[model samples]
Target: VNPFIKEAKEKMKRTLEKIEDELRKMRTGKPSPAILEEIKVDYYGVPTPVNQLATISISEERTLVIKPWDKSVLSLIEKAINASDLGLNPINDGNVIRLVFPSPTTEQREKWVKKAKEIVEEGKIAIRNIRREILKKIKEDQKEGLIPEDDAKRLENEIQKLTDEFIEKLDEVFEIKKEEIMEF
Candidate 1:
């Protein structure tokens, strides 16, 4: 296996993973604990992730209930949530904080679907660029007599196959995410 081929595969895998992560972070109509994955609280003057300071559970009403092991952290958690741009108002009940995730409107879901498309398309472009770079390197090696012409042709085919596989994988990922966003 050529070194550049391995590098191309690794870069494509990373691009796919990044696209998946971005889609996961996009909020749908359902309440997900992941929505709070970015929240940080002042724990004894040290900034700590909210998940580390409290228990985040989903309720029957599709709401997030955060119960802190220490009651003193309730207000701090509430303040941290209030300061976030999530657009959710935390209801602090002196024992726990509740964040009600509202259902997204059709327009909002459409917007998210569009954004997911853009992300997937970007991933495809990145994978193509990687393929182009690797092909160039292989050609250069062949021209310099480092590799035989037959091996160079085989490597070129392999790179094209890899690029196609990754682009298909990205499309499948986008389809799944699109369904999630549009589903009730």
Candidate 2:
């Protein structure tokens, strides 16, 4: 592979990994309270992460239990969970808060698969956009006589092939994740 094409391909691989990390934060029938760390909780008139104000643990693989050392912050934690987009119902038993992750129904699984597909597609589009920008730079360099026309064409072809390979890898990941989400 041409140097520029190799560099762009590596960058796109990194971008796809980042997209996978982001997808992990989405709600699933697993212990994912770390997803809540991004939510802002109203703590004593100040917004903060619930994880910062309490101890969060996976009481079970499917249940996330949070116990706030400061009892006064209990309600705030509940409110934060309610406000977040995780779709979890928080239960405060006057002491600790409980979040039960119900197994995703068939319909919910389908919806999540759809969402995952969309995220994968977006990642592929972003990779293509990066490739386009690099191609533009290559053309500009050729016009400036920094690179010969034949060399530029060869480099562009290499980059296009690398792009196709990475896109295929991304689609493979999407298929795996889709099957995982669909499994009970």
On lDDT, the candidate that comes out on top is: 1
**lDDT of candidates 1 onward, in order:** 0.86, 0.83
Candidate 2 local lDDT, 1-184, one digit each (tens): 5567767967998988977876776676566777777767777788888889888888777888888899988888888778777778989998999899887888888888888899999999988988998999899999999989999998898888878988998898888888778765
lDDT of 1 by residue, 35-123 (tens): 67678887888888888978889996779899899998988888887888666788989998998878778887888789889989998
| Model 1 deviation from the true structure expressed as Cα RMSD, one decimal place | 2.5
Error of 2 at 61 (Å): 3.5
Candidate 1 segments exceeding 4 Å error:
42-47, 70-72
Report residue 62 deviation for candidate 1 (angstroms): 1.3
Model 1 residue 93 lDDT score: 91
TM-scores for all predictions: 0.82, 0.86
Task: Look at candidate 1 and tell me the lDDT of residue 153.
Answer: 91
Worst 10 residues of 2 by lDDT: 25-34
> Which 10 consecutive residues of model 1 have the lowest summed lDDT?
25-34
